[PDB]
Amino acid sequence: NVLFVCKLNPVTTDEDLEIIFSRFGPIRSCEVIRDWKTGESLCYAFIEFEKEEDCEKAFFKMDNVLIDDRRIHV
Amino acid sequence: SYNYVVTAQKPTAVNGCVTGHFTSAEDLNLLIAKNTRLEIYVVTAEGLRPVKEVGMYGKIAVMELFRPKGESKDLLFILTAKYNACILEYKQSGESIDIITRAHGNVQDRIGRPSETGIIGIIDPECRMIGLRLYDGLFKVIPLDRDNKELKAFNIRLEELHVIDVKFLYGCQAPTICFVYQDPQGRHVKTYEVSLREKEFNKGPWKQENVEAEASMVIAVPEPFGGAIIIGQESITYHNGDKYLAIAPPIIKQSTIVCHNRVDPNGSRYLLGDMEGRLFMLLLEKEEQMDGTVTLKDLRVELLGETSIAECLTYLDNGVVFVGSRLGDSQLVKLNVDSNEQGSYVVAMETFTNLGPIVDMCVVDLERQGQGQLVTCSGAFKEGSLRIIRNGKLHIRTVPLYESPRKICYQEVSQCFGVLSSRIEVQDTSGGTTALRPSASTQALSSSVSSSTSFGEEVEVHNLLIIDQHTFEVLHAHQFLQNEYALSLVSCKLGKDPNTYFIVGTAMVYPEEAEPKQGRIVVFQYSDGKLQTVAEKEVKGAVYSMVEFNGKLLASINSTVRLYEWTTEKELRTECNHYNNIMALYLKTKGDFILVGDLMRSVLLLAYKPMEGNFEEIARDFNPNWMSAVEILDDDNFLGAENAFNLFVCQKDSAATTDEERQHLQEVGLFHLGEFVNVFCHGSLVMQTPTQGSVLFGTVNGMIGLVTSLSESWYNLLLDMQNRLNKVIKSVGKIEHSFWRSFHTERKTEPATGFIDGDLIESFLDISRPKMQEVVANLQYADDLIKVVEELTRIH
């Protein structure tokens, strides 16, 4: 029930992404990869939904989703 | 290396002197300590009669006398720099005169940094304790009891940390210690009471008080006056119970007071000596006699005269005063009340020679290639001079300059010495400088001035003097540019120019900077009775030491070491540089090798490669420590003098096959010398064997020394002799030879190696015949050893 997305806006924060995906259903957890040696976001995120229903909703209603003025692919 | 060190000319600079009944209960004796030689004279109407001269295996840093109850003559308390404390007695039977150590012992604490204000040693008026301040925040009390044979010391704590001065006070029920100390709030004077029974301190008679901001010395006024006198640079104060008096006479303002003594037993009159020579006379107002208690009423300070710079003063009986000068000739002077010839009551009586402090030394064959005579730049400030030493007992003759000399060199085709000199002028209201004295740099037959901020400040003016070698009259004097400082001087021909030039390196220093950012090198030509300047070239740094090298002129411009060729145009030109990570204070060139050194013991051994034209390093050595002078002995060994008055020999391993061993100097020998060596120079004083080569050295205290090379078999024989003598010779103070000559620094120590103490070996000739038999019993070398020692004695 976890979806992986890429090509995210660098300024995006985890809380903002979680709130945005909240329309897709409850989110059990969410994280974004950042270069371990610098702290800069890697534009890759993994959001584990509460159930597979939330993941399906995110996949269905998040295709070509414009968040933070950037398209999100997942 | 296996080298050999002997004392050619003994030290003469006076490091302190005391007056007291030491030889006998009826004879008044003066005891003078130069560095290690204690000289005992009897005060006589006609002057001084030298009775004894005893060497010590240690530098005398504290000298005092004390007369414990039940005795007949005052015992001498000596402390060595290495903290060997001894008590000595004078005993003479018939024609025999011996010194007997009543107690001996080393009193250095295992842990502690020595105080920045140096060793202070003091003795109670009633002779019940001996106090020392060797280590900060501590007070070392030695109970002077008849049962304390070994000088068993005990420490007491001191709350303060910067004790400036400290001395006992007379007329106290229990021993008191009055001391002036520093604090982030100011300077204060405090009294403590030493409870020996409880081994602690107790509340003193009169509590803390503020004193001047430059108080320097405490004087214990004896009974019936009592109390203490604090003599700062601006005001003289006196404290005793509830009586506090003070003055600030206008006379003392020019120069501080750096010595004193007691002229009368009752302490109603005191002497004082400044840095500049003035001899002041502090008089107390004893007239305040009311009810058997005498109290101060005035502190008049009267100027007596101008005497040689006083590192110590003693008042011998009947209006005679010994002025012991450490940086000039010592004097016996007289305080005549009714002479008053020029308003000064001081008329010179006798002059004692103080060869040091040597700052530079040149061996020159003045006669027809006979002996090698010494010309040395001795003294400083007003009492500077040139000294000529001949071997034909040595014979010393003086050429006063009335200014400070720096360096000495000798030109043959001009028969002239070149001497760098400094004099101190005072800034005038006109913006210029006026000379204080008629210095030699101004009284020349011919003079020149080189052509190319407050009021009252002292400005140093630097000159080069050409001095004739027959009469020693200043043939010429040349003044350098304002705020210039001449550092190096060499008399050496260059290249293909037949004539012999003078070369002087100069650095321009300004008080607002640290490292001179500009300097110059000046080539003078001395001919036609005039000092023509032939060339000048400016370098972007300071020029410290210079030498000639294979027909080229080296220089130490800052850290850079540079080579100069002397073209046909009489112009220095640069051939090949070298950049170092140390500043090349010392240069010494032998053959193709250069030895370069700085103050931090950094020793580099550069080499010259004429095939390519550059210098390439060969060997290196870093070991943080203070190095005063460094010399080249042979093609391999290198001798230097370093911190704590030490001599070290660095040898380079030619047999090493690995680079890690080829690029390093294996220290071979160390020797605690007891003398701050300042100049090294090749030469010998004896007509031209067990000895090869010869290196003379001059020190601050005024002794000349000779270091030569012994052969392997000779070295081993002499070392066995050294260890065999150290079991029969009963040195004064029971100070062991191995400890005195043991390399010493504030960090760590080693036993001596690589050197033979020439003094001890030469002492063999003076021992009694029966002693010699025990000295060398199983050697298979008694007369052969006499031959050895006499042959060695024929070197210096």
Partner: protein, 341 residues
């Protein structure tokens, strides 16, 4: 005086040859007195640290001439004065705050962790340069509360006449004078009005100067304070600009912006929650640095500011970050991309 508490993270001989542990992923040239934090995750490090806290809480950090290649000859010890072992998330994590204490030369490095057989280099305190000729009478002038330093030479060095060199030569080898010149040169770049003992002062100043690792290794070699201070004087005159190692053509900052935002000096060491230790230097303003991401108070070292990714303009290397309050804006630069020019 907060930045030196690292709140973002449990209280805690000469020439002798000892064998000491080494922490593997650390690469900082620690100089005694500088404080290194660390983060450790692999179990071996955790166990070693626990045993260290038990026994003596010490470990070595090697002054790598090449940290990546682990080829080194000298290093610095460290005493663990604070540590915290949180093993949550099923992985043992130990975050440490230790202080460099002593230095050593490498004899050998036996590989298991590791054990380095090395010898402790002693520290040489050279006594006063005048103490070898000092006149006993004048010693009383050695104590005293442009004019003042002129008086200082005239007083302390009133024995240079007895020797062969002037007083202004012995000012270059006096601890206090050199220390004050270091001060004046420091205040020439900042307005922050640095202990008194020469050894600690020299270590601190040598640490703060924005120089390369080679020169730091050099400065660690020298065991006498005075020579280290002189080498520092030499160094300060030299460095003027800082460039991006990944640029080599674009300067990143000038020494004019250096200002001590932490009591540790303009530059100190920090460790992020993942561990990689960065040497951060604080400057007022940068040049040629673009920002990536937004600010966030997430695990920011300085209490009360935020951080945002900072990288040069041309090669986009991680140069550091840009961080009602005085001062409003400054930049912290990781020394791994600060090449001195």
């Amino acid at each position: 005086s907060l930045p030196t508490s690292h709140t973002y993270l449990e209280e805690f001989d000469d020439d002798s040859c000892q064998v000491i542990p080494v922490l593997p992923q650390v690469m900082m040239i620690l100089i005694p007195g500088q404080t290194l934090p660390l983060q450790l995750f692999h179990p071996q490090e955790v166990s070693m640290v626990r045993n260290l806290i038990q026994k003596d809480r010490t470990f070595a950090v090697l002054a790598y001439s090449n940290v990546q290649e682990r080829e080194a000859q000298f290093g610095t010890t460290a005493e663990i004065y604070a540590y915290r072992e949180e093993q949550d998330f099923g992985i043992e994590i130990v975050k440490v705050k230790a202080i460099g204490r002593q230095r050593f030369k490498v004899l050998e490095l036996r590989t298991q962790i590791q054990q380095a057989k090395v010898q402790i280099l002693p520290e040489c305190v050279l006594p006063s340069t005048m103490s070898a000729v000092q006149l006993e009478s004048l010693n009383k002038c050695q104590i005293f509360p442009y004019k003042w330093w002129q008086k200082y030479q005239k007083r302390k060095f009133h024995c240079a006449n007895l020797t062969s060199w002037p007083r202004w030569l012995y000012s270059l080898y006096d601890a206090e004078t050199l220390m004050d010149r270091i001060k004046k040169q420091l205040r020439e770049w900042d307005e922050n009005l640095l202990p008194s003992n020469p050894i600690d002062f020299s270590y601190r100043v040598a640490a703060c100067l924005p120089i390369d690792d080679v020169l730091r290794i050099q400065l660690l070699k020298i065991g006498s304070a005075i020579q280290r201070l002189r080498c520092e004087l030499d160094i300060m005159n030299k460095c003027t600009s800082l460039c991006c190692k990944q640029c080599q053509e674009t300067e990143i900052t000038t020494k004019n912006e250096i200002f001590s935002l932490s009591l540790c000096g303009p530059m100190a060491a920090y460790v992020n929650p993942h561990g990689y230790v960065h040497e951060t230097l604080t400057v007022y303003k940068a040049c040629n640095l673009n920002l990536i991401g937004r600010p966030s108070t997430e695990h920011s070292w300085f209490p009360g500011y935020a951080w945002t990714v900072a990288q040069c303009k041309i090669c986009a290397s991680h140069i550091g970050w840009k961080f009602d309050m005085s001062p409003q804006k400054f930049w912290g630069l990781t020394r791994s991309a600060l090449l001195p020019t």
